[PDB]
Amino acid sequence: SEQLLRIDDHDFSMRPGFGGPAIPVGVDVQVESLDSISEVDMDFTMTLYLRHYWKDERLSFPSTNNLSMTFDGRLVKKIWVPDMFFVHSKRSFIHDTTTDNVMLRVQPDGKVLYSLRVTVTAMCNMDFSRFPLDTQTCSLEIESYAYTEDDLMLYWKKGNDSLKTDERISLSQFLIQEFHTTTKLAFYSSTGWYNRLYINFTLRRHIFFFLLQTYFPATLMVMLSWVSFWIDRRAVPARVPLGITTVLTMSTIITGVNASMPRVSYIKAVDIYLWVSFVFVFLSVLEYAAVNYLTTVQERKEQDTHAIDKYSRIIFPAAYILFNLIYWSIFS
Amino acid sequence: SEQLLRIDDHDFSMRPGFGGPAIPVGVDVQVESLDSISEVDMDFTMTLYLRHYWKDERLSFPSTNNLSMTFDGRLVKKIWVPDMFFVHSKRSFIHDTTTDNVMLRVQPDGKVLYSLRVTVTAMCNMDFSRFPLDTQTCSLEIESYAYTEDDLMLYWKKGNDSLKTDERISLSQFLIQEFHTTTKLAFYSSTGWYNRLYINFTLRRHIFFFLLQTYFPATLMVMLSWVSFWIDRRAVPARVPLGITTVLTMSTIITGVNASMPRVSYIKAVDIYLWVSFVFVFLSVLEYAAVNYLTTVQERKEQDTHAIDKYSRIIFPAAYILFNLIYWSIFS
Amino acid sequence: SEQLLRIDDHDFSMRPGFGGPAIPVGVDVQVESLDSISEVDMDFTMTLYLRHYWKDERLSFPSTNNLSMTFDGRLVKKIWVPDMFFVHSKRSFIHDTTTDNVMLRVQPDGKVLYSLRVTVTAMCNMDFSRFPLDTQTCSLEIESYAYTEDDLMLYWKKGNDSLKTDERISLSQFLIQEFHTTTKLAFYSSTGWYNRLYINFTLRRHIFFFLLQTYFPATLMVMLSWVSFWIDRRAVPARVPLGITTVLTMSTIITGVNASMPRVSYIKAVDIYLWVSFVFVFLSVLEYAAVNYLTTVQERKEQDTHAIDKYSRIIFPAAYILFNLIYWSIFS
Amino acid sequence: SEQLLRIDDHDFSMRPGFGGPAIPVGVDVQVESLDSISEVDMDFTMTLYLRHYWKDERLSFPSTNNLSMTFDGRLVKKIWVPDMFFVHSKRSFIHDTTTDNVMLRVQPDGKVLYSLRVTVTAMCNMDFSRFPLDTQTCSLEIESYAYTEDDLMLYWKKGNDSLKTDERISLSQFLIQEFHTTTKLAFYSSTGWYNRLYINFTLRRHIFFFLLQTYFPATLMVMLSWVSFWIDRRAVPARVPLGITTVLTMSTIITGVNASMPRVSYIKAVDIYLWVSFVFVFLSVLEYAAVNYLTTVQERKEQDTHAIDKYSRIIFPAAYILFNLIYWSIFS
Amino acid sequence: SEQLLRIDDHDFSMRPGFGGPAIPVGVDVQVESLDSISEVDMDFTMTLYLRHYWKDERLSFPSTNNLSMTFDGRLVKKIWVPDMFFVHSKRSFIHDTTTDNVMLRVQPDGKVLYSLRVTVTAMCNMDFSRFPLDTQTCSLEIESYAYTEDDLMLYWKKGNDSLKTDERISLSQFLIQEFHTTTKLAFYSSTGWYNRLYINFTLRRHIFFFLLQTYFPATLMVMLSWVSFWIDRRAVPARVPLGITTVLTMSTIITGVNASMPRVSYIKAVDIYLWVSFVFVFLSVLEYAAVNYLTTVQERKEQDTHAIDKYSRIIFPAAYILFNLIYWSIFS
Numbered sequence A, B, C, D, E: 001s002e003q004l005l006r007i008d009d010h011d012f013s014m015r016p017g018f019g020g021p022a023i024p025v026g027v028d029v030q031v032e033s034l035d036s037i038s039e040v041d042m043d044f045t046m047t048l049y050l051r052h053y054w055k056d057e058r059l060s061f062p063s064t065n066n067l068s069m070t071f072d073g074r075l076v077k078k079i080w081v082p083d084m085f086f087v088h089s090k091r092s093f094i095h096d097t098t099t100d101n102v103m104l105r106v107q108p109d110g111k112v113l114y115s116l117r118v119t120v121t122a123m124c125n126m127d128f129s130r131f132p133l134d135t136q137t138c139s140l141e142i143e144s145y146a147y148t149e150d151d152l153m154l155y156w157k158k159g160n161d162s163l164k165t166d167e168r169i170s171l172s173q174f175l176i177q178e179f180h181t182t183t184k185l186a187f188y189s190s191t192g193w194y195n196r197l198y199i200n201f202t203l204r205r206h207i208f209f210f211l212l213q214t215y216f217p218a219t220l221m222v223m224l225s226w227v228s229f230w231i232d233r234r235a236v237p238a239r240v241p242l243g244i245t246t247v248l249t250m251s252t253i254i255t256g257v258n259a260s261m262p263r264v265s266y267i268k269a270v271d272i273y274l275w276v277s278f279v280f281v282f283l284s285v286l287e288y289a290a291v292n293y294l295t296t297v298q299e300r301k302e303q304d305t306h307a308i309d310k311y312s313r314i315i316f317p318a319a320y321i322l323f324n325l326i327y328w329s330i331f332s
Ligand SMILES: CCCCCCCC
Pocket: A208, A211, A212, A215, A216, A219
């Protein structure tokens, strides 16, 4: 094998066909798993198989079998091999247990297949201002490092059919949909033009979990705060603790929701809901102070429900309804 | 030794017997420990010994002893060795202190034994919708990377007896049961067919700890909320703070249970319990407002227990009982 | 190629032109992304491309094409290459998947271009005493390790135009502004003088998020504490729980704000706001004790609003206003 | 030196004396520090020096000095060296700054000394059911990887005197006592018999810190709940809030103790204490409801302390005392 | 250069002058930064430059220039170099981007200078029983690994002037003071005597931040608890909730201070303050129960301030004052 190929009779720092046109190289990918997601750092981790095809007649051998052979890794450092890399990546590695996950098959003609197994972490810019009703889209990019479109030609081996995805892929916090591929040509100011391949996909959440954990308790709190309009205004020590305890409860809920968020420092769509229900509960406590002050001054002036109570009984819910209509018209 | 074997007289990029049938290779495993589990990331970590057997007559030597020899590691890179790898793995390594944990024994015939010590992290899809009453099953998969069933034949060396497990294995959060092995043949669309080996096992939790930490306090809270049906309706400042303080207490408990969960964003079987006891406590606070409003309007109209109290005293517990029956009929 | 260049006919431990003047070396940078920031550890992480230019006539070759060639990495360890390093850095590495991200281009003259892809973590001293109204500025420094200004001359290749920045750069907690470059000469007491290059930039926060999360609820709490001046002093069991519950609420808010801060142990500008509103709420609770004690002793002496109430109704808000004026005059 | 020893005249893949009996190899250890402990993962980290002694007459040299020489590391890969490894370990490494921490001394006879500096993480099964009154014992195990008791003989160089421990060893959460060594022979089903060395030690906690942080406040809470037996039963709005506020306080304490525990999911000895004091506080709140209901029905029937109060004043503390006696008889 | 020095004509496994006396080697250090501190693990991280000087006439070359040359790294593995290491260290490394941060300068005589750039984590035993009023001192130790005082002599190159410290060094949680150096001779029982160098320094905190965050709110709580001595004893429903709410508030504060401490399990000087103010608040709640019981029994016996109130008004503060005097006499 090491003899079948005239390894010492050629020069492999030289791309196959240095001189005239660019070498065609064709790519095939199969995704094994998506491993983790960070919302704070804005990135994701994926593990896949990567395959390459090309022809190099320096590697042809005399056999009659019309069938391929096999090598692994050691030969990659003797021969010439392409040099793809992952664009917009934070870290990556190739697996090496119990030996290097690298495969090499060569036919009599010198046609070649070359394959690896890798894990990549790759950046994805996200926007959380519609949280928890956001949708995100991410991508993985592949490019040649050293050779430009005048020396190497990059393309998907079988067009739209060059991506395969494993059956058992899932996340404990997301739903994954819409895998597909595309291409684009890209330019560097000090080095030139290159071809680039993409893999795209889309993410969404489970909205009912967030509904019950956040929107439901605050609504029950705002509804608890309307009870005070139906209690006798003469019962001061039963109308005064109620409001302030309700404020305490709502502040506890809001604090509890703040101590578990992914810690991204700009205003999002649930913060608005929570702070508006805080303001409603606060107004309910101003109302009864108005009523008490007026009843007391009347008592002093002289020496039945109050108008403000029987008006609040109507006004407060209608305005909560009006707020909910507008809010869900804006975030749908 | 390096001379006993004609190392320079052979070609080891070539599998033993390249040409005709596939080489038989036989595997034996002993598990040392399970090291950690992640419920958020859905994976586990294990450490084991791995052993291989095969015959290669390029390694035979003239001795009369009918007994094996020993080598370590350096020789593995001179001779031909198989290339197994762990399927659906996130990371792994071989230990190297104070030197490489690799052993090699060869007999006069050329029969070989080869062994390593490794640690692997490996994915396991879990479903937590019955939490804390869930059960999970995981597995470790082993496969050849480079050679197909037409070049290498993979099997357990001794059938069901090829797995051994250490005596002192345990986790601080789980109970481990039912180790066993099996096999399956698997197919890749661009490379072909391979043999694969499995090791399976099962996990369970301690249910009484979760019972006391979560289900018990909420039940005592719902039972505390029924006390208010037996207090005099004329005692407004002693019936009004009770309910709202009880709501405060229950919200504190629920928040405390949310700040320690493994953070998996979909609805599970304990969330339902907690939110239904929240709704019961909320209804208890609506009840006394009904009673107060009615007594007040009667006082105004004119100028003994109330029916609603003596009806609630019966209705509320029966419905809590009915909820518990249905809930534990569904989750058993 | 390895032959075109007389590799074995020269000595590369020797800088080009050892002897007379210093070699000119010129630098070009393109920033890909800012990856993370730590406020506790005072540092940041960046990923970029780095490019070098120089001439070495040991690498010239006879060709007529007036056009460059290509190599990658392996050649870097055969020839002489500069040795820049990142000053005030905690950690860094060069990417190596699927092979080393290193490029090398040589023209017939022996002019050279050399480029890498790296990730660096680099220290930045920050001062948080104006938090959340702080502004920070950071920088990345580049220097030669081994050769002084008498052997190597470091400069930007194109002056102000030698820095390029990617379009899609962002952080989930900051706004980035004002990239520019400069230079400075620097001195080591036991080794001598060197040239150094800088890249500078500036950071700011989103102030409205911090406003709503911190300053707003405490203000509503201080305003809730003024309600007690308008309730009848004869209603002791409705004036005594109010203050103490309000204290409870404010302490809960402050504790909630302390359990999420970046944990830097010196006094900052929001702590002052929070503790002054604590002191206001505390004084409101001392006030009514004064009023109760005086009314009781008058009752005992003998056997209408009180002056202190109708004075507090004016004094407390004016002093809160006066505090806000001074505070926002100091932090603007 | 490299010449003094006839390196190229011998074969070092071959253990000294391959053939007849087993080589004696003798071990000496000095512990520098214990570095960290994990209670969740059940393991510890230690750093030490390790020393070996043996004789190999392939390394003898003609000198008259009767005194040893020195080498470092590079020679270890030319000659034959033993292959010990740490049994039941999760990770380890050898230090390499500013070069490899390896020492080698050889005398004229061929006697050898060989020493390293390493850090190891090693598993320790712990049982926390007596927490905070638990005691744990851990150990570090040392074994040959490749050679059995028929090829290598492992023993402590000086018996009980072969372990030394540094003066300045401590942990910020434990007290360390009782270092000693021992040996045992161990068996592998597919490879055979080996010798193994042990180092053992013991751990304990500071019990008074846990006492004040956990047992003290709950006791004061249970004692606060007995005050309600001495207040007038006619004071409903002063007897009804007291109990429920006390329940709130105790639930806050318990939640605070749950949010800081090492997160091991089975019932331990402090959980029992806390939940029994919860049940006592709950019964105190049922008591006064009984008393109120009875007084009210008597008032209705007709139209002085109550017996239940003056009985509870005696019964509740005695039963708390009886619980404490039994509890501290069981956990001592 | 590689020729100027007769590399192949000498033996470098042999220290310069093997035989007679010990080689003098002299050390110079410059500290770049202190990077982080762990109070739980008791250690710190530092980054510095390290320099060595010695003479070796195997490296002399014929030149007339009386001036030094330069090499980098590759030569270190051809020639003989010392072998210093950091004593009591947990981890360390040498920086290697964009190449190895190693410098080598040789003069015609064979005098040598050798320098590196490293980061070290190093243990420091701390005692927190005076927290937050503690002071700590730490050190970094440097020693030869392989050679004893009979083969190598270690000393500071310029005495007290051999340490330089960067201008821009700081921590976000500490103040750093008092850098200085010293030396000591040290002994190993199985290997012998060595020289060791030290760098020492001192740390302190910001005490006013801890004062306002911890001591201030508890004091205001103890002062709030004295208000109850001035309210009318006839106002039961206004004297009974006050104490218990105050207890709730103080327990919340203490829990909040426990959920952010560096988690070191022994009693410290702030714990005492907090638990004594807890006991004061608890006694204030026992007091009014005494007063109520006595007034009630007098009412029953028959059918103005109470003595206990007008005595407590004096006794409680004086004892708080007396506690503060003693406490701050003990911790100063
Ligand atoms: C499935 C639970 C839905 C809760 C909706 C609450 C809207 C305020």
